[PDB]
Amino acid sequence: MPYWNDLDGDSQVLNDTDDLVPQKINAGQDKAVLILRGNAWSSHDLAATLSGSDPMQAIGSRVAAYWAREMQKIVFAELAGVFSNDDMKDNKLDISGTADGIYSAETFVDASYKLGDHESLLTAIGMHSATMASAVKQDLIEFVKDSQSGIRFPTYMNKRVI
Amino acid sequence: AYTKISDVIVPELFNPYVINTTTQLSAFFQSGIAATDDELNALAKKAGGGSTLNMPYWNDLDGDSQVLNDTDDLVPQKINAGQDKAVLILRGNAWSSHDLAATLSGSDPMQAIGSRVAAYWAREMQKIVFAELAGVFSNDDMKDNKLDISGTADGIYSAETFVDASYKLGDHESLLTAIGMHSATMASAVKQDLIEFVKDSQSGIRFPTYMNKRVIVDDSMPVETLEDGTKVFTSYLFGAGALGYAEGQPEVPTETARNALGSQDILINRKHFVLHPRGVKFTENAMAGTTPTDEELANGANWQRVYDPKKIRIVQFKHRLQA
Amino acid sequence: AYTKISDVIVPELFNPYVINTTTQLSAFFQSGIAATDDELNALAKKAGGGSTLNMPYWNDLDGDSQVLNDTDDLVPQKINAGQDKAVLILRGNAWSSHDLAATLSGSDPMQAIGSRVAAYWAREMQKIVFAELAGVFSNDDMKDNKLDISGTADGIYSAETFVDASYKLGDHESLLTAIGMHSATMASAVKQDLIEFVKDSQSGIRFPTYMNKRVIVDDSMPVETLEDGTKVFTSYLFGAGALGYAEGQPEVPTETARNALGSQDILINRKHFVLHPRGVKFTENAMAGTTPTDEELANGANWQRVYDPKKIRIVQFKHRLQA
């Protein structure tokens, strides 16, 4: 992968009676892997002419939307791979299990600030329906109807929600 | 590889660009100075190199009136004189890269590596001055009028103690502007108070505000620890207008050179600058050197101030973080 | 002092000349192929490198023949499984001079310095080879069926035992091309058999020949000794046709620098290549690095392979010299 950055290990005092030395740069050690998939499906035949229509057309015009749910099907699995079983990522997961805390108004703040200096590097919030129900009972989720015309892209705190 | 403005090293067309972008991008700013007194110029540029000068001042006449009464006479009175100092510091570092990587990512030379190094020093000052206050202004009886703490496990940092600290300058108010803030605090702030997102730049969003102030999110802060997991934070508050600095010039601001027997090529920067609060005077005691000063021993001990009380202007309060 | 296509370093007109002259001069050749796959070019020339990409094997034969008929299917041409890897190596050196003028550097700097380089830098190639090839058979079981001995107290190395080795290539006989050797053997040869200096080109000179083959001679081959003061020789036999190699290039194949306080100037070459048997995959086990490896480590251990028996193609036999 083509990674880049600059900063390292600073700084140093300029004086005679010394030499500076350099400091090494993190290289492109980021690594990924190609994946490939596919499948196929047949028809019947005499069933086609005997049924009063053609299965081949309907199936063939439904092929496109099939691959979406595949793509999602990979991605969810994979992220669920990164964060599991690794103490090396642990700073990015926050477990409220053990039966207290509801997701309102606080633990949300914990999430959005768990990146200490950098805030507002986040935009959209993934959500399950029943949750945002429990939100709209209590929470302030506010409806900005802006795109003309659409209803509606909800928002919590300078974010988007999906 | 390419035109290689730095790798074929055009020293012009480059160094001014880097310095200026370094100035604007980093903030702070402002808050602190832009274009301090030429005093720091005469300290920075050649000729008459450092280390630092000493500049004097005349405090104002003062005293009671006298009973004006005949069959007696008056007696005259006098003026005094006083001292002030600054310091001068030098910095530099290298870069170990292989031109393969540097212009690998870099490619088009102009914006890339320049923008980077700019962003670099931008953080460097933010480290150095913020370290400069650290020990000094906190350790003395001499500033204590500017330090109050709610610490020792009753205090909340909200909505009151903030005010009182902000009035620790009794007569002089509304000269204060920026609030230095470590993250976890302002987390506790958004958790409670009204801290109000204000959009100035049209259209851009936005610098946060508390009360007619500009809060500043800053990564590197002091922090300490006691036993029992209890924590203590600092979070300076000044927005004084200002500190001061002037850039000055070295010789050879940009140098490009390579090594035959191994395979490398490296960069260097090595800039001068002069920065110090005015503010307390600087002295020389029980330190190594010289010059420049240091980092550690450029903080740990031994500063001495004379004005005193007002127009410093900085105040600190160590507070515990909200439950 | 001179035209100095190297000292004022014109990168054109030189490096290609070097590489070509290198290919013509040193041999082998053949034996080993020239111009291997360019996937190796992807190995040296970016991208795709890293640890060494795999080379396919190619021939038309499947089970010839099959019965032309009716009422019977033919069944297709199938590719048996396989996989392999390799190494990729990076070498170079420097050279010294002095300012007291050992010069000249005649009317042809090009061919002079270029060829005088080509000699050396071509010559190390075969040393790297035999060094490496000493590793497969060193002590390993999985090649055992490709080693043979008539040795231990009776063998003459003439006219028969060689025919045994000629069986040892499993499927393919009369694919032999070249014969590894050490001198004392071919001395005994000159005493016995018809080994015949044969002018190849008319008139161009010339390869010593056993039977329509090009014999190769070098002083470094394994020579060990039992008790009873008698000697054992190795003398590999391959003539596979072939091994393979391809180049790629670093950046700056030619560089010129000087020293200041001392009085000197220096040259360097540093080119890379990929060469090995195919043959065995190359794995990292108990082997330092990385990468490339070594001479020693290129000996010690850790070569494991998949074919098995055929298209190797190399055979060794240890035997007593004529007595």
Side-chain angles (χ1 to χ4, degrees), chain A residues 92-134:
Chain A
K92 272 64 193 179
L93 63 78
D94 185 3
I95 46 103
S96 180
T98 61
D100 59 346
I102 67 172
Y103 159 68
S104 66
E106 279 81 356
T107 57
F108 191 85
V109 172
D110 289 346
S112 292
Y113 275 88
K114 196 59 172 292
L115 308 178
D117 176 71
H118 305 287
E119 186 185 2
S120 67
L121 275 66
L122 308 175
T123 296
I125 309 165
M127 191 74 76
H128 177 279
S129 64
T131 58
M132 85 168 290
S134 292

Side-chain angles (χ1 to χ4, degrees), chain C residues 5-63:
Chain C
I5 62 171
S6 294
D7 294 344
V8 77
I9 188 166
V10 290
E12 296 175 350
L13 182 62
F14 185 88
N15 293 338
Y17 177 78
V18 178
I19 289 171
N20 285 283
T21 304
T22 301
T23 302
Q24 292 180 337
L25 175 58
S26 178
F28 287 161
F29 298 87
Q30 73 287 359
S31 179
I33 199 65
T36 313
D37 57 348
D38 289 341
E39 185 68 14
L40 268 60
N41 290 339
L43 284 167
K45 295 177 179 295
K46 61 182 178 181
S51 178
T52 299
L53 291 175
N54 53 345
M55 299 187 291
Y57 65 92
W58 181 90
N59 194 28
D60 194 10
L61 169 64
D62 183 4

Side-chain angles (χ1 to χ4, degrees), chain B residues 58-123:
Chain B
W58 288 357
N59 60 340
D60 186 2
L61 63 95
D62 50 348
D64 289 347
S65 303
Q66 294 88 356
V67 170
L68 175 57
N69 189 27
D70 54 351
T71 65
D72 188 1
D73 191 3
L74 300 171
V75 175
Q77 289 178 334
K78 68 176 69 178
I79 306 104
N80 288 343
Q83 186 60 261
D84 180 9
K85 297 292 280 188
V87 199
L88 184 147
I89 65 174
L90 310 171
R91 295 291 180 198
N93 68 336
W95 295 105
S96 68
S97 173
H98 301 292
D99 199 4
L100 187 150
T103 197
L104 179 64
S105 62
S107 297
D108 183 74
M110 291 180 183
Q111 295 79 357
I113 54 173
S115 61
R116 303 301 300 176
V117 61
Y120 170 72
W121 291 106
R123 301 177 69 256

Side-chain angles (χ1 to χ4, degrees), chain A residues 4-8 10-15 20-25 106 109 113 116-117 119 157-158, chain B residues 90-97 105 116-117 120 123-124 127 183 186 190-191 197 217 219 270 292 295:
Chain A
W4 172 248
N5 188 337
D6 191 6
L7 167 65
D8 183 8
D10 288 342
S11 174
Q12 190 173 356
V13 170
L14 175 58
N15 178 26
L20 303 182
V21 315
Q23 285 179 333
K24 289 182 170 71
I25 289 94
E106 279 81 356
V109 172
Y113 275 88
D117 176 71
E119 186 185 2
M157 183 178 287
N158 288 340
Chain B
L90 310 171
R91 295 291 180 198
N93 68 336
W95 295 105
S96 68
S97 173
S105 62
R116 303 301 300 176
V117 61
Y120 170 72
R123 301 177 69 256
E124 290 303 321
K127 187 177 180 181
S183 64
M186 81 173 293
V190 176
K191 187 178 179 181
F197 295 166
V217 181
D219 180 68
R270 67 173 66 188
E295 290 78 354

Side-chain angles (χ1 to χ4, degrees), chain A:
Chain A
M1 292 299 295
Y3 176 77
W4 172 248
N5 188 337
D6 191 6
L7 167 65
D8 183 8
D10 288 342
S11 174
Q12 190 173 356
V13 170
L14 175 58
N15 178 26
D16 284 343
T17 64
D18 271 338
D19 290 343
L20 303 182
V21 315
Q23 285 179 333
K24 289 182 170 71
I25 289 94
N26 297 131
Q29 48 191 16
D30 300 343
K31 298 300 286 182
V33 158
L34 180 144
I35 69 105
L36 57 80
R37 296 290 173 80
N39 71 343
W41 41 75
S42 70
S43 176
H44 195 292
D45 184 7
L46 185 141
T49 191
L50 181 62
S51 64
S53 66
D54 298 347
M56 182 170 174
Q57 290 176 337
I59 185 168
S61 179
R62 179 55 60 182
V63 68
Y66 172 78
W67 290 109
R69 55 182 65 83
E70 279 296 325
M71 301 301 293
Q72 176 174 349
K73 187 68 178 296
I74 296 299
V75 173
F76 275 167
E78 189 166 1
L79 267 64
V82 172
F83 292 177
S84 296
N85 285 337
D86 283 341
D87 295 345
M88 295 180 75
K89 295 293 286 190
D90 62 352
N91 289 340
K92 272 64 193 179
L93 63 78
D94 185 3
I95 46 103
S96 180
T98 61
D100 59 346
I102 67 172
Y103 159 68
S104 66
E106 279 81 356
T107 57
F108 191 85
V109 172
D110 289 346
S112 292
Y113 275 88
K114 196 59 172 292
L115 308 178
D117 176 71
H118 305 287
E119 186 185 2
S120 67
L121 275 66
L122 308 175
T123 296
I125 309 165
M127 191 74 76
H128 177 279
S129 64
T131 58
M132 85 168 290
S134 292
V136 178
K137 283 184 291 295
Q138 298 174 337
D139 187 69
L140 55 86
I141 311 100
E142 179 183 1
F143 299 163
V144 172
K145 182 174 61 64
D146 184 69
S147 175
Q148 291 87 358
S149 176
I151 293 169
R152 68 188 61 202
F153 47 96
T155 301
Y156 175 73
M157 183 178 287
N158 288 340
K159 292 286 191 294
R160 290 169 57 187
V161 60
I162 304 303

Side-chain angles (χ1 to χ4, degrees), chain B residues 98 100 104 258-264, chain C residues 46 94 251-252 255-257 266 268 270:
Chain B
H98 301 292
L100 187 150
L104 179 64
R258 66 181 299 172
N259 183 337
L261 297 177
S263 296
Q264 291 89 357
Chain C
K46 61 182 178 181
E251 70 286 6
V252 186
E255 179 178 0
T256 301
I266 54 100
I268 52 99
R270 64 170 64 191

